[PDB]
Design a protein around this ligand. Sequence first.
Ligand SMILES: *[C@@H]1O[C@H](CO)[C@@H](O[C@@H]2O[C@H](CO)[C@@H](O[C@@H]3O[C@H](CO[C@H]4O[C@H](CO[C@H]5O[C@H](CO)[C@@H](O)[C@H](O)[C@@H]5O[C@H]5O[C@H](CO)[C@@H](O)[C@H](O)[C@@H]5O)[C@@H](O)[C@H](O[C@H]5O[C@H](CO)[C@@H](O)[C@H](O)[C@@H]5O[C@H]5O[C@H](CO)[C@@H](O)[C@H](O)[C@@H]5O)[C@@H]4O)[C@@H](O)[C@H](O[C@H]4O[C@H](CO)[C@@H](O)[C@H](O)[C@@H]4O[C@H]4O[C@H](CO)[C@@H](O)[C@H](O)[C@@H]4O[C@H]4O[C@H](CO)[C@@H](O)[C@H](O)[C@@H]4O)[C@@H]3O)[C@H](O)[C@H]2NC(C)=O)[C@H](O)[C@H]1NC(C)=O
Ligand SMILES: *[C@@H]1O[C@H](CO)[C@@H](O[C@@H]2O[C@H](CO)[C@@H](O[C@@H]3O[C@H](CO)[C@@H](O)[C@H](O[C@H]4O[C@H](CO)[C@@H](O)[C@H](O)[C@@H]4O)[C@@H]3O)[C@H](O)[C@H]2NC(C)=O)[C@H](O)[C@H]1NC(C)=O
Ligand SMILES: *[C@@H]1O[C@H](CO)[C@@H](O[C@@H]2O[C@H](CO)[C@@H](O)[C@H](O)[C@H]2NC(C)=O)[C@H](O)[C@H]1NC(C)=O
Lengths: 52, 51, 110, 126, 51
Amino acid sequence: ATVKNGTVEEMKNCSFNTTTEIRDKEKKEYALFYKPDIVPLSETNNTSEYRL
Amino acid sequence: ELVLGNVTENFNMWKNDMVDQMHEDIISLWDQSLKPCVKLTPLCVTLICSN
Amino acid sequence: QPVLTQPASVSGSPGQSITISCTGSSSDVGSYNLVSWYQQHPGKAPKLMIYEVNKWASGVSDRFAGSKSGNTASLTISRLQAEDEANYFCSSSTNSATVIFGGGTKLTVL
Amino acid sequence: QVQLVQSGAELKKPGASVKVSCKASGYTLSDYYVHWLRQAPGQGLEWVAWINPTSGRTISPRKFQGRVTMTTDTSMNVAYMELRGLRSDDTAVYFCARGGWISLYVDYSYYPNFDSWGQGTLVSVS
Amino acid sequence: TRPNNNTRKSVRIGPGQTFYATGDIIGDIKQAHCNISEEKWNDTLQKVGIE
Ligand SMILES: *[C@@H]1O[C@H](CO)[C@@H](O[C@@H]2O[C@H](CO)[C@@H](O[C@@H]3O[C@H](CO[C@H]4O[C@H](CO[C@H]5O[C@H](CO)[C@@H](O)[C@H](O)[C@@H]5O[C@H]5O[C@H](CO)[C@@H](O)[C@H](O)[C@@H]5O)[C@@H](O)[C@H](O[C@H]5O[C@H](CO)[C@@H](O)[C@H](O)[C@@H]5O[C@H]5O[C@H](CO)[C@@H](O)[C@H](O)[C@@H]5O)[C@@H]4O)[C@@H](O)[C@H](O[C@H]4O[C@H](CO)[C@@H](O)[C@H](O)[C@@H]4O[C@H]4O[C@H](CO)[C@@H](O)[C@H](O)[C@@H]4O[C@H]4O[C@H](CO)[C@@H](O)[C@H](O)[C@@H]4O)[C@@H]3O)[C@H](O)[C@H]2NC(C)=O)[C@H](O)[C@H]1NC(C)=O
Ligand SMILES: *[C@@H]1O[C@H](CO)[C@@H](O[C@@H]2O[C@H](CO)[C@@H](O[C@@H]3O[C@H](CO)[C@@H](O)[C@H](O[C@H]4O[C@H](CO)[C@@H](O)[C@H](O)[C@@H]4O)[C@@H]3O)[C@H](O)[C@H]2NC(C)=O)[C@H](O)[C@H]1NC(C)=O
Ligand SMILES: *[C@@H]1O[C@H](CO)[C@@H](O[C@@H]2O[C@H](CO)[C@@H](O)[C@H](O)[C@H]2NC(C)=O)[C@H](O)[C@H]1NC(C)=O
């Protein structure tokens, strides 16, 4: 979404799939990550897809 | 075992800590016993069972 | 989520003292000392009369006490004159990052 | 000199929507957080939301989440607050007010130190 | 100071072990910083300078 208006520096919101209380029942989760810990994934420019 | 012919000595069974050395040593002994074996893992899945 | 409370209506006596209080939870009134008091006349807008318990708002006469204690606070008004006939609201901020108002109480004549 | 002149009143059907605007005067809106408040006839003052007019970041307690959407146009120097899905309760006098100074190093967004208030505008319902 | 109010979110990642992330941030977003008094820093730096 971006904030874009200045006077602010913020923390990016990301999501991933997890090995839950059952091993083979992968479910959805979300987490806030500080920007340096996250990088763009691939030259295939899907901007929503990021890498730890 | 040899008797101590002329003695008088106090014992306190509860306050003894030798049993604690036993307890810690036997637990550490068993903990090492579970190192080389297989740590299951694939079986903690959904199980389909008869009814 | 609004929870803050106070006696819904009371009366004073000229020249004497009155207690106008408000109460909440440790989450909102005790966790933060950030408390304030407001005066609004019907047909007009409010007017900041206390902030942060006892910082002196503009135009406030020394009658208007400001104190806090635990889950409570109050305008322990002293010398209690008559030219303030409208209400005296309370307010505080919750630890959930929100502002809360009281239910208002009237400084009745008096 | 300070004024927070709001727009006029306007009656709406229940379940309708209404845009309410608040005009700055004597100061630039980017200084302070803008708090939105309300007063129904015979009820007390109800806190609705704040907006950080620069980043447009907002928080509203529980009752108005989904109900209220927020914008500002600091070039025009005006603050807006929309309601959707109205009810009979919305017969009430909305007040816009400026809160604390916007500091980059201390969070003053969320505490009750309202400095000046709008005159008052009324959404109404039948 | 870190004026942001981060909240920790517990995630369960694999059998019997958990991962802790950051959930929603309470309040407004602010910048992290460190402060020093500049007259005392200037005096200290000049004192280094004469050495
Ligand atoms: C690290 O480091 C860092 C750095 O430093 C840090 O940070 C920091 O911190 C701090 C602490 O926290 C903070 O502080 C804060 O600040 C803020 C700001 O300040 C500033 O500003 C302001 C404003 O300005 C404006 O206005 C003016 C006038 O007044 C003018 O002049 C200017 O110019 C501006 O203007 C605007 O507009 C215009 C129009 O035309 C335009 O043109 C322009 O452009 C703009 O826009 C000011 O004011 C200030 O000053 C003041 O103060 C000082 C001190 O500081 C003094 O000295 C002075 O004298 C002054 O005073 C006056 O005023 C006041 C107010 O403020 C009053 O009170 C008095 O009495 C007098 O009158 C400056 O310059 C501020 O604001 C804040 O304050 C607040 O808060 C506090 C807390 O503590 C409290 O205490 C107080 O009380 C206050 O409150 C008040 O105010 C507000 C405002 O709005 C309100 O809201 C409230 O309600 C109250 O009210 C008042 O008023 C009313 C009337 O209106 C009345 O009625 C009542 O009663 C009351 O009185 C604070 O202080 C800072 O900021 C920071 N920084 C930054 C950068 O951000 C950190 O912290 C470190 N670290 C650590 C850890 O610590
Ligand atoms: C980071 O991103 C994640 C998403 O990837 C985000 O989590 C989402 O938060 C929202 C808000 O809480 C969740 O959506 C709500 O879920 C509840 C479930 O009880 C619903 O009832 C809600 O629906 C009502 O509210 C809507 C407005 O919010 C109304 O428009 C609607 O008509 C309903 O009345 C609402 O859908 C959502 O489930 C999560 N998503 C996930 C995957 O958990 C998170 O908040 C983001 N972090 C930050 C800091 O923003
Ligand atoms: C940060 O958020 C927490 C949680 O909303 C605020 O308060 C804490 O609330 C929990 C649960 O009620 C209590 O167990 C803690 O004792 C509270 N902590 C404090 C310091 O009061 C906390 O106030 C928030 N801090 C800021 C700066 O916004």
